[PDB]
Amino acid sequence: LKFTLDCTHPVEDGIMDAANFEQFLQERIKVNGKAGNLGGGVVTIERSKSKITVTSEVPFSKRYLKYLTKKYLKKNNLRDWLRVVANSKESYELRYFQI
Amino acid sequence: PRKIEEIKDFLLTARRKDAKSVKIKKNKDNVKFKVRCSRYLYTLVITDKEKAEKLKQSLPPGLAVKELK
Amino acid sequence: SSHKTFRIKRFLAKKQKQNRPIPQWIRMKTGNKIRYNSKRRHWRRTKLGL
Amino acid sequence: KNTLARRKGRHMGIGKRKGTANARMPEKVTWMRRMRILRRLLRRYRESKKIDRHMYHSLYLK
RNA sequence: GCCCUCGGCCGAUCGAAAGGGAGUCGGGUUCAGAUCCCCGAAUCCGGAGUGGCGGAGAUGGGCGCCGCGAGGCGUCCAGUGCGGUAACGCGACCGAUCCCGGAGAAGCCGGCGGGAGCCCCGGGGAGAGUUCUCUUUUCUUUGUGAAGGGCAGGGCGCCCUGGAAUGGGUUCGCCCCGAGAGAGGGGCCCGUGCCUUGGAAAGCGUCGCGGUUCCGGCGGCGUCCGGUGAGCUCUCGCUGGCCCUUGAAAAUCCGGGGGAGAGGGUGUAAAUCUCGCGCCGGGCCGUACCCAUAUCCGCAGCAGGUCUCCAAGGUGAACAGCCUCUGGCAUGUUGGAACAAUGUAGGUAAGGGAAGUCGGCAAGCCGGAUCCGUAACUUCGGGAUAAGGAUUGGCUCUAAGGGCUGGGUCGGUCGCGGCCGGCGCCUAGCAGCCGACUUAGAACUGGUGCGGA
RNA sequence: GUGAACUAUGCCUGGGCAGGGCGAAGCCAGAGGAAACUCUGGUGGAGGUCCGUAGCGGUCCUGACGUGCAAAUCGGUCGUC
Ligand SMILES: [Mg+2]
Ligand SMILES: [Mg+2]
Ligand SMILES: [Mg+2]
Ligand SMILES: [Mg+2]
Ligand SMILES: [Mg+2]
Ligand SMILES: [Mg+2]
Ligand SMILES: [Mg+2]
Ligand SMILES: [Mg+2]
Ligand SMILES: [Mg+2]
Ligand SMILES: [Mg+2]
Ligand SMILES: [Mg+2]
Ligand SMILES: [Mg+2]
Ligand SMILES: [Mg+2]
Ligand SMILES: [Mg+2]
Ligand SMILES: [Mg+2]
Ligand SMILES: [Mg+2]
Ligand SMILES: [Mg+2]
Ligand SMILES: [Mg+2]
Ligand SMILES: [Mg+2]
Ligand SMILES: [Mg+2]
Ligand SMILES: [Mg+2]
Ligand SMILES: [Mg+2]
Ligand SMILES: [Mg+2]
Ligand SMILES: [Mg+2]
Ligand SMILES: [Mg+2]
Ligand SMILES: [Mg+2]
Ligand SMILES: [Mg+2]
Ligand SMILES: [Mg+2]
Ligand SMILES: [Mg+2]
Ligand SMILES: [Mg+2]
């Protein structure tokens, strides 16, 4: 459903890696309570060198997306600078905490 | 508040004497024409954009034709 | 109470208008022998009979 | 979580109830539910002519 | 103004900031006021002689001609509306004294049903919390006033057809029927629910942009889809029970009976109008705040007293007790340091078990629920939870208890679907889907613990 | 002469009172009898009914206090609901 997850600023100043974050999602997604294998090829994640599309054919949810990116930020000790907001419909953009 | 069905009835209450104002409210699906008279606020709802436009053209002069934007 | 009559409102109006300290030039007046308002009412201590 | 367990039957017990059986589930409500169910079934059978008026009345009274 | 006609309020007046009593709501705003100010939507009552504008009353028939006819000419006669078998309906739709009725205007208790609000469950958003591990997670939020119009829903001893025993409908209970059942078709009332106008422009939640020392700034996006119920609380309705108890009055407003009267001579008419719109007005007094372990009374910031409304989650029978959220507070007119006696309040106690004492005073024992089992006596109702006994946790299951849909033999043809029929036999019903809380039984399990507070 | 602002009682008009137990009349069904009827199971929800909240009251500790918090209060236990 094109839940565009966009992070240009942190990879812009080089504090996280879109490829291994994509790997993190690729392992720890869930479809019907199963990790790995994307439900059996049913969700597809591409990274267009600055942002990640998570296309799907199931009722998958962007609040679950926000929960997973918060989990990634907490795991990599980053969510004291970064903050996941809804910049638009069908998209989540990370932002730095006030300067 | 009263809701008017026909353009001719809207036009005669628009050219009534006590008709203080007309406000045009452009909604996403339709357009509302609210004429403020003495006792009631009368509302006409039109779904056709060109029909609403030609009504705006054929509205009588000497009235406030205020758009709500 | 908040439900008053006009004349009990007048009574309370007069009482709170005259519950007021004495001016200070009164003491400088010649032959004064009055130092303070001696009949000032406090709402908690002395109650109106009304 | 405890509501899920009580749905599965847990903590319902006999050492877990404090009111009487009628206080927890009233016999008037039970009988009323049963009568509504059985009368509705009899009305459907009489409408679809699996039974007739006379069978319906005797079964109603029973 | 006089005269005639007609006439019981037959008794002044006061008496309720909880009785009766037309008609205002939403948002915003203050240091302190707001249903009263501002903005926006309404509404009630009173007034209109010259009547302010529409609409209703109300505008049709007969006969002679002209005119192809339509349509005109003149004459004569109606007209205080119309529809439905009905219940009744429609936008108005004359009418006095007088009379009749209704509303205002009726107790307490029970049981059900409908509607809302709250609570609860499943998803979608937005923003937060947790992330040592797990958690598609946890928390918050997720609007539409009054007044119109339409439709659900509820109620009806309201109407018409028809005639019912092999009696039948029907409630939790009842109850109903030749004085008219069931069935079929209507009508009315209520409509606080939903849709719409109001209305998104406002409110709210988020994400931003610039400073009018503080803009009802400006913008984006959103404000979504469902399901449950003997839940609680209001409210509406139906139907019972109780009474040597039968549960106000009056202002006020309405309907009807009757028809004294009034309206015009067929006009582009009148009297009249409880219809629609328009115009003007609504004075006087109260309105802050406290409302009580500190604004009241008790001589006081006094453990006393003093009438109400609203009421979340868990456990649980529960408005019990105990813990928590919204909201509130600072321990009740001081603190610090020690932890003697005597106290006040609360516990525990070997072995005995009322020997204590006037006296089992005080304390203790018992306690919930489920399954058994209950004596004398009796006014036959009771006694009665008599007495007495067993069980009670956690975890994993197994049964039973419901609600929706569809069951169709074949194009015999076309209006990969539709019209009539040769075409066919779940008829012991099945098939699919949805959804609750219970109750009973069993296994395992624990230092025999389990109404664990 | 002044008082029913406390209290006593009558009247008028308002407000209020969880959750449970027992299970009266009325009613439905099944079974036994020649009847009269009888038995069983439900339903129903009566009562100056019972346990027990709020409320109202005030038993006992002859508890606290007794120059009090109080010119009659407080706590537990109680009565009724
Ligand atoms: Mg005082
Ligand atoms: Mg008289
Ligand atoms: Mg008076
Ligand atoms: Mg009054
Ligand atoms: Mg205020
Ligand atoms: Mg709305
Ligand atoms: Mg009938
Ligand atoms: Mg908006
Ligand atoms: Mg905004
Ligand atoms: Mg006030
Ligand atoms: Mg006090
Ligand atoms: Mg005094
Ligand atoms: Mg406590
Ligand atoms: Mg203390
Ligand atoms: Mg202190
Ligand atoms: Mg104090
Ligand atoms: Mg001992
Ligand atoms: Mg011992
Ligand atoms: Mg002894
Ligand atoms: Mg002795
Ligand atoms: Mg002795
Ligand atoms: Mg004792
Ligand atoms: Mg005995
Ligand atoms: Mg066991
Ligand atoms: Mg008195
Ligand atoms: Mg009693
Ligand atoms: Mg009590
Ligand atoms: Mg006492
Ligand atoms: Mg004593
Ligand atoms: Mg009692």
Beta carbons of B55 and B30 less than 8 angstroms apart: no
**How far apart are the C-alpha atoms of D11 and A23, rounded to whole Å?**
44
Q: Which residue has the tokens 């030609």?
A: B54
Three state DSSP letters for chain D: CHHHHHHHCCCCCCCCCCCCHHHHCCHHHHHHHHHHHHHHHHHHHHHCCCCCHHHHHHHHHC
Longest dimension (CA), chain B: 32
- Strand F contacts in D 11-30 (CB under 7 A): 19-23, 26-28, 30
Technique used by the depositors? cryo-EM
**DSSP conformation class of B52:** H
Asked whether strand F has any atom less than 7 Å from the CB of D54, the reply is: no
Three state DSSP letters for chain C: CCCCCHHHHHHHHHHHHHCCCCCCHHHHCCCCCCCCCCCCCCCCCCCCCC
Nucleotide nearest to B33 (CA to C1'): E197
Evaluate the CA torsion angle B45, B50, B53, B59 in order and state its sign: negative
Q: Return the structure tokens found at D11.
A: 């903590």
Instruction: For residue D17, give every residue at least 6 positions away whose Cβ sits within 8 Å of its Cβ, in sequence order, or none.
Output: D24
- Strands of the A46-47 sheet, one edge to the other: A46-47, A51-53, A4-6, A91-96, A82-88
Query: Tell me, what amino acid is at D59?
Result: L
Q: What phi and psi values does residue C28 have, to the nearest 5 degrees? A: -85, -15
Query: Tell me, what amino acid is at A82?
Result: L
**How far apart are the C-alpha atoms of B22 and B35, rounded to whole Å?**
4
**How far apart are the C-alpha atoms of A29 and A44, rounded to whole Å?**
11
Three state DSSP letters for chain A: CCCEEECCHHHHCCCCCHHHHHHHHHHCCCCCCCCCCHHHHCECCEECCCEEECCECCCCCHHHHHHHHHHHHHHCCCCCCEEEEEEECCEEEEEECCC
Question: For chain D, which chains pass the contact test of at least 3 CB pairs under 8 Å?
Answer: none
> CA of A69 vs C1' of E107, distance in Å?
69
Asked whether strand E has any atom less than 7 Å from the CB of C4, the reply is: yes
Q: Return the structure tokens found at B22.
A: 């007309």
Evaluate the CA torsion angle D2, D6, D8, D10 in order and state its sign: positive
Burial of A2 (0-12, 13-18, 19+ CB in 10 A): exposed
- The residues facing A5 across adjacent strands are A52, A92
Asked whether strand E has any atom less than 7 Å from the CB of B64, the reply is: no
Instruction: For residue B36, give every residue at least 6 positions away whose Cβ sits within 8 Å of its Cβ, in sequence order, or none.
Output: B19, B20, B21, B22, B23
